[PDB]
Amino acid sequence: MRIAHDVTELVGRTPLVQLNRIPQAEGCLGRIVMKLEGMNPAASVKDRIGTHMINSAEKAGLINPETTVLVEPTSGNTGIALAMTAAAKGYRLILTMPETMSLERRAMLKAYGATLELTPGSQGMKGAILRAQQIVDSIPGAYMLQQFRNPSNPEIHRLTTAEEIWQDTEGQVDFIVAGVGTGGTITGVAEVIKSRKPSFQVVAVEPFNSPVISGGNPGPHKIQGIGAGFIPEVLRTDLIDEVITVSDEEAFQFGRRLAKEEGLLSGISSGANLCAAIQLAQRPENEGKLIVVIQPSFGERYLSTLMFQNIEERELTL
């Protein structure tokens, strides 16, 4: 009988889909397909690390539902993934965040029964991290996921994401194009596929306004999900063949085009990923080559984010 024990067994195994209009309109020579991480149970790639970081820590005997309080600073999708996972497996979870985070995302975390603690909006993610550290020190048995440093983050991408790409393309994949958040996705795929296919190339994506992997300064940008303004510990920097930078407006416009010309409602990072993949596919040396690009999230979350953001902007003017 095909009945899952709980929702955490339903993450990953996401499909590939070809693009029928955008690459053609852009005169692409390479072949672009999208991996739909938006089709995870809670609609983002995170679901893979939300589940595995906890599974890994359980399997190692570090954590237990009856005793361990989970803690993590997070203003993005990892919080949602952890909240779902914790509710499914019976964990108490505390998430810390800046007050600036969308009300929609706060309601999402609370809906899953996560405990929220807000931190000053000016202190950014830095205040959230410091507060998260206190809470772990305050609670015996407590455990910090540390998504940017946790080895089980790239591990799950090695074990699942990479194998799905390898199998579904039957070894034909020539490129991965992936925006870097924690860097877990691109790293796991790079580690596995480069070891089987040395010709396989790895293309990282980051905001133009925060071009840190390219060697520039960190900065404010609007590509939610990528570009944390430092180089994450879990990122295998040695495996990256190229970084492409994408403006906020490019990322947004290609997101609009994915929705309207392909029927793929996606977050802004999907638009960033595609933008970079388009440039890559236009290069003559890449004709006939198979480019896998990640859609990190379904776009409905981002849409309500933009809606609440617009409401707040109009009431804060003058």
Ligand X SMILES: *Cc1c(COP(=O)(O)O)cnc(C)c1O
Q: What are the residues facing 82 on neighbouring strands?
A: none
Q: Between 50 and 127, whose beta carbon lies closer to a second copy? A: 50
Active-site annotation holder among 269, 270, 289, 297? 269
* Minimum distance, C-beta of residue 84 to a second copy, in the bound complex (Å): 5
Phi/psi zone of residue 117: left (φ > 0), alpha (ψ -120 to 50 degrees), beta? beta
Per the CB < 8 A criterion, the answer to whether 176 and 236 are in contact is no
Per the CB < 8 A criterion, the answer to whether 81 and 50 are in contact is yes
Q: Is 311 in the site for a second copy (CB under 8 A)?
A: yes
Angle of helix 103-111 relative to helix 77-89, nearest 10 degrees, comes to 10
Angle of helix 77-89 relative to helix 47-59, nearest 10 degrees, comes to 50
Instruction: For strands 290-295 and 173-179, give the pairing.
Output: parallel
Contact region for ligand X (CB under 6 A) — 5-13, 15-23, 181-189, 308-316?
Answer: 181-189
Q: Is 46 in the site for ligand X (CB under 6 A)?
A: yes
Q: Between 183 and 299, whose beta carbon lies closer to a second copy? A: 299
The answer to whether residue 110 is catalytic is no
Contacting residue, 50, 76, 79, 98, with ligand X by CB under 6 A: 76
Q: Is 181 annotated as a binding residue?
A: yes
CA angle (145 as vertex; 163, 178 as ends), nearest 5: 40
Chain-centroid distance, C-alpha 213: 17
The answer to whether residue 194 is catalytic is no
Contact region for ligand X (CB under 6 A) — 16-24, 90-98, 222-230, 245-253?
Answer: 222-230
Q: How far apart, in whole angstroms, are the C-alpha atoms of residue 86 and residue 114?
A: 8
Active-site annotation holder among 35, 44, 46, 297? 46
Per the CB < 8 A criterion, the answer to whether 248 and 221 are in contact is yes
Q: Is 185 annotated as a binding residue?
A: yes
Contact region for a second copy (CB under 8 A) — 60-68, 135-143, 222-230, 263-271?
Answer: 263-271
Q: Is 231 in the site for a second copy (CB under 8 A)?
A: no
Q: Is 89 in the site for a second copy (CB under 8 A)?
A: yes
Contact region for a second copy (CB under 8 A) — 108-116, 137-145, 148-156, 274-282?
Answer: 108-116
Token pair listed for 280: 């890559």
- In angstroms, the Cα distances linking 278 to 21, 143, 246, 315 are 12, 41, 11, 38
Q: Between 62 and 111, whose beta carbon lies closer to a second copy? A: 111
Contacting residue, 23, 79, 183, 255, with ligand X by CB under 6 A: 183
Q: How far apart, in whole angstroms, are the C-alpha atoms of residue 130 and residue 115?
A: 17
Per the CB < 8 A criterion, the answer to whether 71 and 132 are in contact is yes
Q: Is 168 in the site for a second copy (CB under 8 A)?
A: yes
Binding-site members are 77, 181-185, 269
Interface contacts to a second copy, rule CB under 8 A? 1-10, 15-18, 20-21, 33, 36, 38-39, 41-43, 84-90, 103-104, 107-108, 111-113, 167-170, 172, 256, 259-265, 298-301, 303-304, 307-308, 311
Binding-site members for pyridoxal 5'-phosphate are 77, 181-185, 269
Give catalytic residues, as residue numbers: 46, 269
